[PDB]
Amino acid sequence: TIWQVVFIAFLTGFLALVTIIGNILVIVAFKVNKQLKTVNNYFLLSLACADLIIGVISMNLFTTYIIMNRWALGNLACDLWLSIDYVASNARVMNLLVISFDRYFSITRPLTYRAKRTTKRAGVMIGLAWVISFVLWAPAILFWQYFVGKRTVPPGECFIQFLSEPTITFGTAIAAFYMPVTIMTILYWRIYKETEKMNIFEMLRIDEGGGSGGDEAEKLFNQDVDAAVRGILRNAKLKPVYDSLDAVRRAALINMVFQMGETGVAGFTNSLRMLQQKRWDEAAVNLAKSRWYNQTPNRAKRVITTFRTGTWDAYLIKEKKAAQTLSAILLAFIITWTPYNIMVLVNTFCDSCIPKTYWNLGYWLCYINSTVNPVCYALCNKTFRTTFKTLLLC
Ligand SMILES: C[N+]1(C)[C@@H]2C[C@@H](OC(=O)Nc3ccc(F)cc3-c3cccs3)C[C@H]1[C@@H]1O[C@@H]12
Ligand SMILES: OC[C@H]1O[C@H](O[C@H]2[C@H](O)[C@@H](O)[C@@H](O)O[C@@H]2CO)[C@H](O)[C@@H](O)[C@@H]1O
């Protein structure tokens, strides 16, 4: 009826508009901001590309197929839609796998990947994913009707030919969706556990803004930090404070003796006392007024924060921020696409058990995943929230 056509036509355009607006802003945010240009940001820019294609082409075309209750766009337009639709969405699963192995390899491979991240190398990865995804689906969808000779697709209907068999589709959804989902789940929970770990060596690494130097180099770092402890114990002016501190706040003390020496730190007589009196906020205010805070306010602010809170917050906030962002991107991907794939599994053991409508809903729901990503960006990352605001108004 007229009600069903206008109702459908509204929310598809409403969702299509949100998608196009959001993904078009994030792409501008990367070009309009010199502070958003990171390796991680480059990847997310790739998703917006595939996501923007979905919001522009796939939503309007497929929305016409379901509205008119039949496909009338022509035969060659059908092979382009399905191919582009499947090549783009497949690149999305590729980008997510790369984003996962980026953080994972960034958190597990400080030797090579941590120090091998180049915005030029990134382009190679995105290049692989897009070219690979194109090859897997474009030729198969376009030319399959030629290898078999005839076309199984009735006129006025548009669907992938070689996917007509349900058993063949089940194996395809396994490799295309389930397996990538399984891997990304494995990498996440490992990255998640990594976000809670921190010691004095990584504390000094971060403060120094440096990196590893192999085995021989890492053994020397251990000697120097070990000797730093002895100096504190041999020093009669520091050992009292050190012995009355917790494992975290002790690392903060070693962080100072490492930067200024035993005698230099022993000069903080008042501050070294308030620490032994566990008057954290009072000692923090005192250390803030020293020259040491004016000569290295970044390193001091973190070490001082450690004394106040007694936690690794100043040395882990960056890692957690990314972890939360990745959790959102994954969760959106899992929530929206799972229905459709669960139908593929069900339909494999059922001659006909899914109505034509349930399939069309899962198909459009998968599209919605391309609508939520820009929202997740602005919700978690603060830089996107401000950059998006200055684009609409300013
Ligand atoms: C546009 N989509 C709505 C996207 C999401 C849905 O695909 C899925 O969830 N998995 C699949 C199930 C069977 C199959 F043979 C291939 C797929 C996939 C193709 C690319 C990534 S998985 C259905 C279509 C498809 O292009 C994707
Ligand atoms: O700047 C030299 C440094 O000597 C001590 O600190 C570290 C030093 O940075 C390491 O290279 C290695 O030598 O171990 C030393 C500590 O045992 C002082 O503690 C430090 O103040 C001084 O700057």
Numbering used by the authors: 63 to 259, 1001 to 1118, 482 to 560
Copy text from the publication.
An example are drugs targeting the muscarinic acetylcholine receptor (MR) family, which comprises five subtypes.
The single differentiating interaction is that in M2R, the B ring interacts with Phe181ECL2, while in M3R, the residue at the same position is Leu225ECL2. An M3R-mT4L fusion protein was expressed and purified in the presence of 6o (BS46), and crystals were grown in lipid cubic phase. We obtained a 3.1 Å dataset from 93 crystals and solved the structure by molecular replacement. Compound 6o (BS46) binds to M3R in the predicted orientation, making all interactions predicted in the model, with the fluorine oriented toward Leu225ECL; overall, the crystallographic result superimposes on the docking prediction with an rmsd of 0.377 Å. The selectivity over M2R is enabled by an L225→Phe substitution in the orthosteric site, while in the other three muscarinic subtypes, M1R, M4R, and M5R, Leu225 is conserved, and so the compounds show no selectivity against these receptors.
